[PDB]
C-alpha cells in the first residue's frame, strides 16, 4: 500500500519528528501488514505507549495510541526498617522513576522485585501492593504499601564431621550467633552471606593453624522453617590427620638475595604445620623485597604432603617484579580537612620508589583518625611511562566531633555522671578541642582541653588544659577537708618507639582548703608553711599557688586493649615544684601490669600488678596532705574500704561547728574530751607500695559458646601505705605509722564482662591480715564507666 502522507493520533510528549524517525515506514513508500506490525511493535518498544493501533483511513495511515501515563510521584507507606531514600534509589536503579511512564503490566513485577529486596534484607513474609492513582493530563501516581512482617533469626548452627573440637568451641569464634543472652553484648541473631563466608574462613584458619592441612569444607546448607521465622545452618567438613613441617625449599628470581631469606625460612625440623606462620614468612619476604625496591614481589606457597609419614614440605615460589616510581600523591574528597592532615599520615613518599605495604600502612593510618567514613586507594598509571604511577586516596568526610554524656555506679564513687562536648577536627586542622565534666559522690571536675597532635613533623604534640576541681573528703572515707582548686597545664608528647612515649610539661594550680578537722598530720604541714591556726575550732582556710614541672613515661605492649592475654604496660609519673611557688615538694608514681600466658590458646593467664609511690618536701617543709597516696578499694587492694589503708588521724580536743546529740562526733570538748584522740578515719601517706598476683581461668559453668566474653580470676592482693615524717618519740601511746612492715593482705574471686548497662566487674575478697582501724568491705562492684 503506497503511502502519500503520515498522521498520528495521541502524540503528547514524543515529538512527531521522533516518531517519523523511529518508524521503518516513511511517506512515499509501499506498505503491507508486515511493515505495519513492525511499526506497531517499534512504538510499543519505545516504552512510552501502552496501546497502539495502526489502521488505514480512506487514504491516510492513521495511528491511534494511548501513551502510558507519565509518572508524577511515587509514595511509600510502611517502610519501617527501610529508608525511603534507599528504597527510591533501588527503584530508580530498577528503571522506574519520576518523569517516566507507568507500564500497566509490570505491577506484579515491581512488587516481586521489592519483595526480593526484602528477602535479601532478612524479612521473608513481606507483602508489597502497588496502588495506582490516575490524574488528569494522562498522569498517574504509584503508591506502594508494604507489609514488612517479622524478621527471621538463626535458631541453630551445626557442624558435622568434627571429632577433635566440639562445635561450641568453634562457634565461639564466629561472627554469626545462635544464642544472645540479656547479660552480655556478643552480637545479633541475623543472617548475612558475608558473615557466613567470614565464618567459613575463620573455621578453615582454626583448623589449618593446628596441623590439619587436608581440612576441607564439603558443603554448606541453609534452611528455613515453613513459617519462615527461623533459619538453620549446617556445615559438613572432613578434618584429616595432623601433619608435620619437615622442611622448606625456595626457588625463583630471588634477585641475588638468597642469603637474607634462608634465615627467614628457618624452623625446628619436626614442627606442627601452621598457616599463620607461612603467611608471616611470605609477608616478611615481601617486606624485604620492598626494602630493596621491588613493589609487587609475588610469593606463593605450595605444600607437598606425604601421608605415609605425615610430613609437609613447603615450596615457596618468589617472583620479584619490576621497580615502580611514584610521581604524585593525590587526595580527593577533603573538602574540609587540609592536605597536610592527610599527607603527614602517609608512609609512602612522593618522588621515590614504590611499596604497596607502605600504601596500605597509609590507608590504615588514615582510617584510625576517625575523620573519614570510607578510605579507598587507586594506583593509576602515567600515560607514556612504564615505571611511573600516581597514587590516589579517595576519602569521604565524617561528622568530626561528638556530644558525649554517660552514667555509672560503683561502691567507690557511688553514682558517677559524665558529660562533654568534643570536636576532633577544628576547621580541618587536626586540633582537638573539648569541654568535659564529671561528678561523683566526692568531687566535681571540669576541664577545657586543646591539643595539636603535630607540633613538629615527626609527631610531637603540644597540649593545653584548664581545670576546676572541687573535692570533699568526708565523702571519700577520709578526714574532713574541702579543697577547691583551679589551674592550667601544658605538656609535650614525644613518641620514640611506637610503644614508648615520653611527655613533659608545666602547670599552675591554685588550691583553697577549708572546713578542716584538727589532726596532727595536718599541723605538721601547716607549721612547716609558717601558719599558726587554732586547735579548738575548724574555721580554717589556707590558699596556695604552685607552679609544677611534670614528667612522665609510658610503655604499652599489650596484645589487646580488652581482655589482654600477653604483654606489659608501665607508667611513670612525676612532679616537682620549681622556685617561686609557695610549696616545695616532689612526687613520683609508678604503675605496672604484666600478663603472662601459660597455654597456646590463651585461656590460662598469670597477671601481675604493682603500684609504687613516694613523695617528700625539700626546704625543710612537708608534702601537702592533699597530694598524698591512698590504698584500698577495687583497684589496689580488694576486700578493704576505699582509702582506708594506712595512717589514721589523731584528733585534738576541739569544740564542733553545731552540736546536736544523736550524731557521732570526733572528740569534741562538749563530750568529755581533754587529750589527744585516736580514730579510724584515714588520712593517706607520702609512701605507698601495692602488689597483686592474679590467676585468670576460663569460666567453668557458662556455656563454651560465649564463655570467652567473661573473665574469671582468683587474686591475692597486698598493700601498705605509711608516713615517713611521723615522729614516734613524741606521740608514744599511739602506733607508729612510719613502719612499712604493716602489710595488708587479701584474697578472693573476681568476675568481669561487658553488659548493655556498661562494663561490669564483681569481686568478693576476704582480708586475712588487717590492723586496728582498717574497715573491711568484701563485696565490690563497678557497673558502668567508673
Amino acid at each position: 500500500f503506497v503511502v502519500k502522507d503520515i498522521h498520528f493520533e495521541g502524540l503528547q510528549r514524543v515529538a512527531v519528528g521522533a516518531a517519523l524517525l523511529s518508524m521503518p515506514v516513511r511517506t512515499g513508500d509501499t506498505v503491507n501488514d508486515e511493515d505495519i506490525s513492525n511499526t506497531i511493535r517499534a512504538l510499543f518498544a519505545t516504552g512510552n505507549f501502552e496501546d497502539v493501533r495502526v489502521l488505514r483511513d480512506g487514504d491516510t495511515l492513521l495511528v491511534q495510541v494511548k501513551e502510558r501515563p507519565t509518572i508524577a510521584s511515587i509514595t511509600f507507606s510502611g517502610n519501617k526498617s527501610v529508608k525511603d531514600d534507599m528504597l527510591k534509589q533501588n527503584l530508580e536503579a530498577s528503571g522506574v522513576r519520576v518523569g517516566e511512564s507507568l507500564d500497566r503490566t509490570t505491577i506484579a513485577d515491581i512488587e516481586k522485585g521489592l519483595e526480593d529486596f526484602y528477602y535479601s534484607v532478612g524479612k521473608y513474609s513481606a507483602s508489597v501492593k502497588a496502588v495506582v492513582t490516575p490524574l488528569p493530563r494522562n498522569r498517574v501516581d504509584l503508591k506502594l504499601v508494604f507489609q514488612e512482617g517479622v524478621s527471621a533469626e538463626i535458631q541453630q548452627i551445626n557442624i558435622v564431621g568434627n571429632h577433635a573440637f566440639t562445635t561450641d568451641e568453634l562457634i565461639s569464634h564466629f561472627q554469626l550467633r545462635d544464642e544472645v543472652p540479656w547479660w552480655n553484648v556478643v552480637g545479633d541473631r541475623k543472617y548475612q552471606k558475608q558473615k557466613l563466608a567470614g565464618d567459613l574462613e575463620t573455621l578453615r584458619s582454626y583448623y589449618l593453624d593446628r596441623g590439619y592441612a587436608r581440612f576441607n569444607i564439603d558443603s554448606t546448607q541453609v534452611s528455613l522453617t515453613p513459617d519462615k521465622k527461623g533459619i538453620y545452618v549446617t556445615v559438613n567438613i572432613t578434618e584429616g590427620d595432623q601433619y608435620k613441617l619437615s622442611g622448606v625449599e625456595v626457588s625463583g628470581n630471588l634477585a641475588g638475595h638468597s642469603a637474607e631469606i634462608e634465615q627467614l625460612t628457618k624452623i625446628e625440623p619436626g614442627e606442627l604445620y601452621n598457616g599463620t606462620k607461612v603467611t608471616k614468612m611470605e609477608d616478611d619476604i615481601k617486606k624485604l623485597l620492598g626494602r630493596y625496591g621491588y613493589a609487587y614481589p609475588r610469593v606463593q606457597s605450595m605444600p607437598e604432603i606425604n601421608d605415609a609419614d605425615k610430613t609437609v614440605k613447603l615450596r615457596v615460589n618468589v617472583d620479584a617484579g619490576n621497580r615502580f616510581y611514584v610521581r604524585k600523591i593525590r587526595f580527593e574528597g577533603n573538602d574540609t580537612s587540609k592536605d597536610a592532615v592527610l599527607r603527614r599520615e602517609m608512609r609512602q613518599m612522593e618522588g621515590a620508589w614504590l611499596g604497596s605495604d607502605l600504601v596500605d600502612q597509609g590507608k590504615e593510618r588514615l582510617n584510625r583518625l576517625g575523620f573519614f567514613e570510607t578510605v579507598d586507594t587507586d594506583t593509576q598509571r602515567v600515560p607514556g611511562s612504564p615505571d611511573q604511577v600516581d597514587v590516589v586516596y579517595k576519602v569521604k568526610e565524617r561528622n568530626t566531633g561528638s556530644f558525649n554524656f554517660g552514667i555509672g555506679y560503683g561502691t567507690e564513687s557511688g553514682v558517677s555522671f559524665q558529660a562533654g562536648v568534643q570536636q576532633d577536627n577544628w576547621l580541618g586542622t587536626g586540633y582537638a578541642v573539648g569541654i568535659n565534666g564529671t561528678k561523683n559522690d566526692y568531687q566535681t571536675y571540669a576541664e577545657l582541653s586543646v591539643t595539636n597532635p603535630y607540633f613538629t613533623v615527626d609527631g610531637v604534640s603540644l597540649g593545653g588544659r584548664l581545670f576546676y576541681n572541687d573535692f570533699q573528703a568526708d565523702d571519700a572515707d577520709l578526714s574532713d577537708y574541702t579543697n577547691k582548686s583551679y589551674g592550667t597545664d601544658v605538656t609535650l608528647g614525644f613518641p620514640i618507639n611506637e610503644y614508648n612515649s615520653l611527655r613533659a610539661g608545666l602547670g599552675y594550680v591554685h588550691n583553697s582548703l577549708s572546713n578542716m578537722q584538727p589532726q596532727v598530720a595536718m599541723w605538721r604541714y601547716l607549721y612547716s608553711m609558717g601558719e599558726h591556726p587554732s586547735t579548738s575550732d575548724q574555721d580554717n582556710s589556707f590558699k596556695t599557688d604552685d607552679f609544677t614541672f611534670n614528667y612522665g613515661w609510658t610503655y604499652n605492649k599489650l596484645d589487646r586493649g580488652y581482655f589482654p592475654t600477653d604483654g606489659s604496660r608501665v607508667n611513670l609519673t612525676g612532679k616537682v615544684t620549681i622556685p617561686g611557688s609557695d610549696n616545695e615538694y616532689y612526687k613520683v608514681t609508678l604503675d605496672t601490669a604484666t600478663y603472662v600466658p601459660i597455654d597456646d590458646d590463651h585461656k590460662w593467664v598469670v597477671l601481675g600488678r604493682t603500684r609504687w609511690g613516694y613523695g617528700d618536701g625539700l626546704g625543710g617543709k612537708e608534702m601537702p596532705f592533699y597530694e598524698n597516696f591512698y590504698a584500698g578499694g577495687s583497684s589496689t587492694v580488694r576486700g578493704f574500704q576505699s582509702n582506708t589503708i594506712g595512717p589514721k588521724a589523731v584528733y585534738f580536743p576541739h569544740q564542733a561547728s553545731n552540736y546536736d546529740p544523736d550524731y557521732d562526733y570526733e572528740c569534741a570538748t562538749q563530750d568529755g574530751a581533754k587529750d589527744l584522740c585516736k580514730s579510724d578515719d584515714a588520712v593517706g601517706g607520702n609512701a605507698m607500695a601495692v602488689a597483686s598476683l592474679e590467676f585468670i581461668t576460663p569460666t567453668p559453668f557458662i556455656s563454651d559458646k560465649y564463655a570467652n566474653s567473661v573473665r574469671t580470676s582468683f587474686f591475692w592482693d597486698m598493700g601498705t601505705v605509711w608516713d615517713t615524717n611521723w615522729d614516734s618519740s613524741q606521740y608514744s601511746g599511739y602506733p607508729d605509722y612510719s613502719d612499712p612492715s604493716n602489710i595488708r593482705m587479701s584474697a578472693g574471686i573476681a568476675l568481669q564482662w561487658m553488659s548493655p548497662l556498661g562494663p561490669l566487674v564483681f569481686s568478693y575478697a576476704q582480708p586475712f591480715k588487717k590492723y586496728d582501724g582498717d574497715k573491711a568491705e568484701q563485696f565490690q562492684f563497678n557497673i558502668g564507666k567508673t
Binding site: 566531633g401 556530644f403 554524656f405 554517660g406 552514667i407 559524665q418 548497662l757 556498661g758 558502668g784
Partner: peptide, 10 residues
C-alpha cells in the same frame, strides 16, 4: 569505656 548512654556525632 566512656559514653554508655549516647556518643552523639552531631
Amino acid at each position: 569505656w566512656n559514653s554508655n548512654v549516647h556518643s552523639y556525632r552531631f
